[PDB]
Amino acid sequence: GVEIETISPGDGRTFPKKGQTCVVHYTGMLQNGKKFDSSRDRNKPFKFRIGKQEVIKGFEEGAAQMSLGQRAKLTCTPDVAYGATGHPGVIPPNATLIFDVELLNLE
User: Fold this and answer.
1) Contacts for 60 with CB less than 8 Å, ≥ 6 apart
2) Is 99 an annotated catalytic residue?
3) The total number of structural domains that make up the chain
4) 38 belongs to a structural domain
5) DSSP for 37-80, written as a single string
6) 4 a catalytic residue
7) Which of 11, 21, 43, 68 is the most exposed place for a label (fewest CB within 10 A)?
8) Which domain holds residue 91?
9) In a domain, 13, yes or no
């Protein structure tokens, strides 16, 4: 249930594929709630690859539907990330996630 709302600029053609390690200035956001995560805080913009089930399913599917330089706005359903369990103390069970995602990557 990934719903992309792209802030326009970028190139719109450099698409993420398998075997590609990419860099995201992500920022987590809880719906009707405060923040819980920001890659802009640590200034280490989270190098990660595609397809090895490192990230959640909602962030993984939203990553493939973007391109270089773009600025998306995810809306992750509870069932794809944590909605049965919830991350203990940080993410409550059955929560709906908001992500500010900017892709400035390699490969």
Assistant:
1) 50, 51, 53
2) yes
3) 1
4) yes
5) -BHHHHT---EEESSSS-S-HHHHHHHHT--TT-EEEEEE-HHH
6) no
7) 43
8) 21-102
9) no
State the DSSP code for 94. S
On whether the CB atoms of residues 102 and 37 are closer than 8 A, the answer is no
Catalytic residue among 36, 48, 50, 98: 36
Say if 32 falls within a structural domain: yes
Our answer to whether residue 56 is catalytic in this structure is yes
Question: Reported resolution in A?
Answer: 4.4
26 catalytic per annotation: yes
User: CATH number for the domain including 62?
Assistant: 3.10.50.40
Technique that determined the structure: cryo-EM
How many CB atoms neighbour CB 34 within 10 A?
6
- Considering the domain boundaries, does residue 45 fall inside one? yes
